[PDB]
From a paper:
The fibrillins and latent transforming growth factor-β binding proteins (LTBPs) form a superfamily of structurally-related proteins consisting of calcium-binding epidermal growth factor-like (cbEGF) domains interspersed with 8-cysteine-containing transforming growth factor β-binding protein-like (TB) and hybrid (hyb) domains. The molecular organization of the fibrillins, and the related LTBPs, is dominated by calcium-binding epidermal growth factor-like (cbEGF) domains. Related domains, the hybrid (hyb) domains, which have sequences similar to both the TB and cbEGF domains, are found near the N termini of these molecules, with two being found in each of the fibrillins (Corson et al., 2004; Pereira et al., 1993; Zhang et al., 1994), and one in each of the LTBPs (Gibson et al., 1995; Giltay et al., 1997; Kanzaki et al., 1990; Yin et al., 1995).
Here we present the X-ray crystal structure of a cbEGF9-hyb2-cbEGF10 triple domain fragment from [name], providing the first high-resolution structure of a hyb domain found in the fibrillin/LTBP protein family. Crystals were grown in the presence of 20 mM CaCl2 in order to saturate the N-terminal cbEGF9 Ca2+ binding site, which is likely to have a relatively low affinity for Ca2+ based on previous work (McGettrick et al., 2000; Smallridge et al., 1999, 2003). The overall shape of cbEGF9-hyb2-cbEGF10 resembled the tetragonal pyramidal shape previously seen in the [name] cbEGF22-TB4-cbEGF23 structure (Lee et al., 2004), with slightly smaller dimensions of approximately 6.5 × 3.5 × 2.5 nm. Like the TB4 fragment, extensive interdomain contacts were observed between cbEGF9 and hyb2, and between hyb2 and cbEGF10. As expected, both of the cbEGF domains in the structure were found to contain bound Ca2+. In cbEGF9, Ca2+ was coordinated by three side-chain oxygens (Asp807, Glu810, and Asn823), three main-chain carbonyls (Ile808, Ser824, and Ser827), and a single water molecule. Coordination of the Ca2+ in cbEGF10 was through interactions with three side-chain oxygens (Asp910, Glu913, and Asn928), three main-chain carbonyls (Ile911, Thr929, and Ser932), and a single water molecule.
Author numbering: 1 to 147
Write the structure that this text describes.
């Protein structure tokens, strides 16, 4: 006989899975709390979304008040203080956050990072976003600057 390792299926939404005999356990960090089913960490505390990681620290606060799942599944390199490195949802991937089951929902990057478009209008799209330039202007290579 062997125990099933349920953690292989990434059952713990926004949490860490710990296998156990006959079951599994989801653990939440201090910015979240378990739902009734004990498989989803519901975000309770916002924190800083960092655009970069350098040496042993995180830099460039792009928004001081983001949901970790929103930050980390889109434009953030890291989140919080002290910070931890962002990983996209293993099921939904970049641009989306996992809500329940394998259900993914679009992240609005224009809300995660107000000002992501340096001199244009941020326009959210499903799975990404784009910068809309003033009339007569076009985007640079990075897509964030209008010229
Ligand atoms: Ca198990
Ligand atoms: Ca989006």
């Amino acid at each position: 006989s062997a125990d099933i390792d349920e953690c292989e299926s990434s059952p713990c939404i926004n949490g860490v899975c710990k296998n156990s005999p006959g079951s599994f356990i989801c653990e939440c960090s201090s910015e979240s709390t378990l739902d009734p089913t004990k498989t989803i960490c519901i975000e309770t505390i916002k924190g800083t979304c960092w655009q970069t990681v350098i040496d042993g620290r995180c830099e460039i606060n792009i928004n001081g008040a983001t949901l970790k799942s929103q930050c980390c599944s889109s434009l953030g390199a890291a989140w919080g203080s002290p910070c931890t490195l962002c990983q996209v949802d293993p099921i939904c991937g970049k641009g989306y956050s996992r809500i329940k089951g394998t259900q993914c929902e679009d992240i609005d990057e224009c809300e995660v990072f107000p000002g992501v478009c340096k001199n244009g209008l941020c326009v959210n799209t499903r799975g990404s976003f784009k910068c809309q330039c003033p009339s007569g202007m076009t985007l640079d290579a990075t897509g964030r600057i209008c010229l």
